[PDB]
Amino acid sequence: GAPTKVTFGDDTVIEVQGYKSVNITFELDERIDKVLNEKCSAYTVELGTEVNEFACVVADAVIKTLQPVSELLTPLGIDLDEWSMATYYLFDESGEFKLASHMYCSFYPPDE
Amino acid sequence: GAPTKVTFGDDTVIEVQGYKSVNITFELDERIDKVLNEKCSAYTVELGTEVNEFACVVADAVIKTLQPVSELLTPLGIDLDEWSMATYYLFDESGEFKLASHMYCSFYPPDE
Ligand SMILES: [Cl-]
Ligand SMILES: [Cl-]
Ligand SMILES: [Cl-]
Numbered sequence: 094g095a096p097t098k099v100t101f102g103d104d105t106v107i108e109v110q111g112y113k114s115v116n117i118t119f120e121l122d123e124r125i126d127k128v129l130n131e132k133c134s135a136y137t138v139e140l141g142t143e144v145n146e147f148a149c150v151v152a153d154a155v156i157k158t159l160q161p162v163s164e165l166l167t168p169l170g171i172d173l174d175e176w177s178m179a180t181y182y183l184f185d186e187s188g189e190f191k192l193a194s195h196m197y198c199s200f201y202p203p204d205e
Numbered sequence: 206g207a208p209t210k211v212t213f214g215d216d217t218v219i220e221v222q223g224y225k226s227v228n229i230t231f232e233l234d235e236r237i238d239k240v241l242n243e244k245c246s247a248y249t250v251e252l253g254t255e256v257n258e259f260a261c262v263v264a265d266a267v268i269k270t271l272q273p274v275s276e277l278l279t280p281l282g283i284d285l286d287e288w289s290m291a292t293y294y295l296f297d298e299s300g301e302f303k304l305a306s307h308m309y310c311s312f313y314p315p316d317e
């Protein structure tokens with residue numbers, strides 16, 4: 094959670110921190126997966142981050158995106174309080190719990 | 206005041222921020238210049254920082270170091286309130302207002 098310090102010759106010091114560009118395709122609710130892919134799909138996370146920890150980041154981003162329009166989600170049958178503390182799963186294109194270029198976000202594990 | 210973003214191939218992103226290791230030799234008050242060189246002489250500053258802005262950083266570090274012992278500085282004739290808003294000068298080994306490996310901190314400009 095802190096950058097790496099690299100020292101060179103003439104007392105010059107650079108701090109380097111690594112990240113990976115993660116784009117999330119949402120499979121939470123088919124009727125709003127489109128707007129979730131537009132408004133809260135781009136993420137930049139440290140290489141050392143755990144997927145179970147990155148889950149809470151995407152989770153808060155989902156609720157923070159949907160809270161201003163919660164009253165429009167009630168006629169769709171979506172209760173944010175149910176979503177606000179539900180379990181969020183992320184996995185790579187092959188259904189593995191590893192960070193990757195493209196990932197899926199679903200309420201259910203990646204099938205088999 | 207923000208790091209530089211560098212993108213590589215497989216969606217890997219690194220943030221790089223540069224600094225220079227500055228060690229200050231104090232010429233403020235001969236009787237306490239020793240302890241100032243021991244307790245608040247090491248600094249790490251961005252390459253783009255201005256010296257007049259780095260002056261306020263060293264200034265607050267001086268007062269923050271001396272405030273717990275202000276009552277010991279009164280018999281020495283040092284008033285921190287006078288120091289707390291005095292003018293601080295920094296210059297390189299050749300008396301230039303440029304950041305360098307080694308710098309001097311004095312209440313007076315670098316002579317000629
Ligand atoms: Cl409502
Ligand atoms: Cl990947
Ligand atoms: Cl950084």
Ligand SMILES: [Cl-]
Pocket residue numbers: 275276279
């Ligand atoms: Cl006193």
Ligand SMILES: [Cl-]
Pocket residue numbers: 103304305306307
């Ligand atoms: Cl230098």
